[PDB]
Ligand binder design. Sequence first.
Ligand SMILES: CNc1nc(Cl)nc2c1ncn2Cc1ccc(C(=O)O)cc1
Length: 164
Amino acid sequence: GTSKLKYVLQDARFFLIKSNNHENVSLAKAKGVWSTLPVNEKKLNLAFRSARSVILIFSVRESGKFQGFARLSSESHHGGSPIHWVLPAGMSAKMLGGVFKIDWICRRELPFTKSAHLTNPWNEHKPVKIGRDGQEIELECGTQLCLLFPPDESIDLYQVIHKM
Ligand SMILES: CNc1nc(Cl)nc2c1ncn2Cc1ccc(C(=O)O)cc1
């Protein structure tokens, strides 16, 4: 069902994550971690204290799809382990240094063609697929976007609800 999902999404904040490559999203799904650039890291750390749930919605650049969504379970932390990210051309390894722990809510894909009816007030009402890494998605648009994803029956939201 969708009832526990709706409960997790209640009064949540939503951020669009854009990854340059599929490998880091795969690593994030395997290890329950994410790292971003310092500007976005500060925003997510602020949001984590501000909201009952902070939801990251992932899209790999050029894929035409979202790859899933996850909830922050921690602020960023250093020195736990050097996650073997694949660095973009130019991107150093100290720029992706802060590691957030995340709990996946859905590891299924959603093509952009299915979200074409959703616009983001915080990005000039452009379609929600449009946005830079870290773009905040307003509550109503982000809730409907998450509800569009196919159900991920491999995930049990009971433990996610307890961390709230
Ligand atoms: C493990 N975390 C990550 N992995 C990958 Cl592959 N891309 C990420 C990412 N977090 C953000 N992005 C996209 C991005 C946006 C701007 C620049 C730049 O201004 O150079 C570089 C990358």
